[model samples]
Target: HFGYGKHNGPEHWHKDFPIAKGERQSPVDIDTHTAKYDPSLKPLSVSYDQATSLRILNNGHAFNVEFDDSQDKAVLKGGPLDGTYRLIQFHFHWGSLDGQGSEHTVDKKKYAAELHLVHWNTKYGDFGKAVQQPDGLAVLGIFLKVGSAKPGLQKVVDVLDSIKTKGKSADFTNFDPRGLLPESLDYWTYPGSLTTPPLLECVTWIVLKEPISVSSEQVLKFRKLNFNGEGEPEELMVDNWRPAQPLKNRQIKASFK
Candidate 1:
């Protein structure tokens, strides 16, 4: 009942992102080519940040927000953010030049753009210091599947016009990303480094297998954004994704239990 589509990518990110060329870029097809076991595969329990409201910020390109570290109950590494953690910055990844935009490979198949909510455990005092620790960071991955109709994607789609140009991000104001989460928390776990440059190997990733359907036009609007940024003639963004990389003996686990 699922398949990949072409187009609706990020032709604009090339000039916008500073480190795609020298770093390991994202947007790989999700294909679990290898089935191997990693003893360090540890999963943790996650909870909502009910008391610690979501704070939105303008991250130059995307609207970023931080979560209450206390909400992250899933501490597989037993490091920071266990119970008294503080959140740092969070951002999203979308297709620049193609429809599929996922960083990690799953069963060897990729979906359309991925949203990553990055946070650090304040247990070690601050985010900078935590990044050096083994269990300093945690990222929540949300998969986006493009559909035919405009299924409420206009929320983000509407903002595209506001920040249509590069380096022109506006305030997210009253927007809360929690409403975008899939009903099921069931997810897949993995122990690997980041997909991009400064690919620090100090965090744990939780990627959800189930996907949320977003309208095709919604994705088109994302492509419309100016990845090339300010004054430059707007480039039709799409196809700014990176090819998939080998799992390199890494293990990805599912939390379907």
Candidate 2:
């Protein structure tokens, strides 16, 4: 509403989070080949039944779909997973209404945006308690960008009307978000932290290399969302991206096996 960048630009977000103003941040590149990685991890299959409890949220920044962990089953087409997993919140990372928009940066190139599917280790019982433990959280990162204007995301985008203003959210009703799955569930798993404030360290990151497409219209609104969910002139949050950082001595593992 306020010319897009006023309430959604990264320039205005520096006050709340002084940490984001550093030079050691990431910029949405997808370079994994140059990273030191472990090649023995395997991806567990996530089934549609387990994915039915999805909750679509349009909190005005990027459109995020979250599911109830206590309500979801971790099984794909069979019984529950060997271990246990709980769905938490899912959000996105995008650039200003222009280029350099993405969550994960490989070499130095950033994408249009990135989606995060956060989950908790079911071994600990509750998500709140699990988040405090060492191996408590697991998040899936799905990269999104402006492609050939695919129509598949229309179902998820339709709810934007209800939550147009900040902190405005609807029940999402009887709809299930499992229908938005990409062709392949195959992914890469590793350890990373939250890109936002309070950069949580207890996260097992699983980012998908495959890119998905969203329309230019859909991409435009993301630069207007409020991360704090608070309205008005104070700290109107939008485009809360943590520039990608060096992997350092970290070893990223893939679940291809």
Top-lDDT candidate index: 2
lDDT of each: 0.54, 0.58
TM-score of 2: 0.75
- Quote each prediction's TM-score: 0.69, 0.75
lDDT of 2 by residue, 42-139 (tens): 45556435454455665545556666566555432111123555666667776665466676765566778777777777778887777666567776
Those runs of model 2 whose alpha carbons end farther than 4 Å from true positions after fitting are 1-30, 36-39, 50-63, 74-82, 224-238, 255-257
Q: Write candidate 1's Cα lDDT for 93-166 as tens digits.
A: 66754446666556666678777766666577767776677666677777787765434445667766776654
Instruction: Provide the global lDDT of candidate 1 against the true structure.
Output: 0.54
Clashes of each: 30, 16
